[PDB]
Ligand binder design. Sequence first.
Ligand SMILES: [Cl-]
Ligand SMILES: [Cl-]
Ligand SMILES: [Cl-]
Ligand SMILES: [Zn+2]
Length: 647
Amino acid sequence: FDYTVEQFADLQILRYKVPEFETLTLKQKELVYYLTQAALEGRDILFDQNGKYNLRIRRMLEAVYTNYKGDKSAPDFKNMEVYLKRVWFSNGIHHHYGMEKFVPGFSQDFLKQAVLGTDAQLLPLSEGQTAEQLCDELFPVMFDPAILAKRVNQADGEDLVLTSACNYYDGVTQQEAESFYGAMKDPKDETPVSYGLNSRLVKEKIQEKVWKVGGLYTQAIEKIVYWLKKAETVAENDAQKAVISKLIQFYETGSLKDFDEYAILWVKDLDSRIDFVNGFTESYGDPLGVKASWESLVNFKDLDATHRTEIISSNAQWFEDHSPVDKSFKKEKVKAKVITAAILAGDLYPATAIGINLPNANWIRAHHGSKSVTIGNITDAYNKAAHGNGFNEEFVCNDEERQRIDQYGDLTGELHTDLHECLGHGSGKLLPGVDPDALKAYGSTIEEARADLFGLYYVADPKLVELKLVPDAEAYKAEYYTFLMNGLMTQLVRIEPGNNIEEAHMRNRQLIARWVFEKGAPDKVVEMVKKDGKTYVVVNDYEKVRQLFGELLAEIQRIKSTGDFEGARTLVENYAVKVDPALHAEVLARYKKLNLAPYKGFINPVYELVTDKDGNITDVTVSYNEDYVEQMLRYSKDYSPLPSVNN
Ligand SMILES: [Cl-]
Ligand SMILES: [Cl-]
Ligand SMILES: [Cl-]
Ligand SMILES: [Zn+2]
């Protein structure tokens, strides 16, 4: 199985497996199938939300790309192909992370000739429009760097609504937009709807054009609703069926009270094996933070992985009791499901998340609860795709370590994460009267260090062999080596030339690693050595490293529990911030030679329904033999119901 698909620009395309899909019942597979169809119909929605020209530009390049009869080896065509592939990755003409608009690496004359040589019937022309007019429309949008430069703008002294190419507002200023929603809000509403979540705000009166059946985007929403109605007929139980039924109504009415009702039912549906997301969910695509991008995920519970986190959870008190922290900081009584993604769509595709924490409505989270999950097969795909990429070959000090990391690194890294997330933050307590914010700007860095150290100290414990979480007592050394190598050295690849460590998690890792390095130095517990001008991290006593991790854990627990700001500051400023310029440049030059793309995204598997003569389903199969170009072209042909212009 090949986890890697292709690489272009600053992007690498991967694939993921859907483990245990074949173990589901046939009816369960049917429900997954329908939900995945409901997911795939939404792709055009996100494109349009990210820019009113995106569907035209996508469809123009797509018509050129698939019918081109010219020299496909020529640089103009190759750069146009890269551009289109970036548009597919980013669901628009702007960088999926940076928001800046892509720079075409091909000439306008080339595109003009390519467009004119395409059957005009195949171009996304409006009625009565010519190919020349479509180019006059789109070429400034594509080629002029000053036009629609950012998909989301965060700058001051600018009208962020007009300065942002996203398509949630049309002909409305930022002050008009914020005022509309500032006025609509009711402070006294204890169960407030998510004002403005599902509409374009336009001036036509400032009014809302709601995304719903019979409204804006109805061509795609109608298809989503069709497949959801199919899914409704094969629900696993009545709770999940009610979720599906309410979600259909929300799409049919556009009512935001239906959305809250749906979200309440969704949080109550905690038992079902299969779950999904399908809606306008997160609001980061909007510079005002009001409108939500469309996304979808279909999934089923990863039983084995969830069981492992439940083993960790149910032993919370054992880890607390045996902790190396001072007894006065220990909780006397102290008390994370994993899901398998079946398909990704909308703002989860192809660039996706490793965890989902929903719903967003605070009053629903407070009174009814929430679902917070991690996506095990996406995390695993990340890990598997990295094997053999050249990184450990370049930076690991010797072949024994490389062999131990290849064998155990993935397992013990994820286990360390599980310890950090399931127990590390929950462990320990403040002393009476101590302000939780006593560490001020250092609080986040110290708190993440504390949880990481809890995980590091315990990933090495023999208890974990007994508990059947690690297969033998040496496995932890893989995680120990990579944590110290990343903390002292290889995370510098994320720092720009001439800068220091800024982000809290990067700081907490350098903090831990540099402290252990300093404290172990008289016994050469950890060394940094050069061969042929390259630096390597050398670990000489793994047992002493565990003891040092424990000593720093105790010290950091004391800092937090007593509110020791000066202690926090001392640790952060002395260990966590300063970058050695020579090491930084050395690591970057070694890293850039590996040609590793900084961003990843995933293609989906392909599901097929098998029916009999009458059409009764007899099986549902999953396949992985589709690449990036194939899947994008197939989605644009078969899962692309929106008009090119949505006005
Ligand atoms: Cl415009
Ligand atoms: Cl939700
Ligand atoms: Cl490697
Ligand atoms: Zn954390």
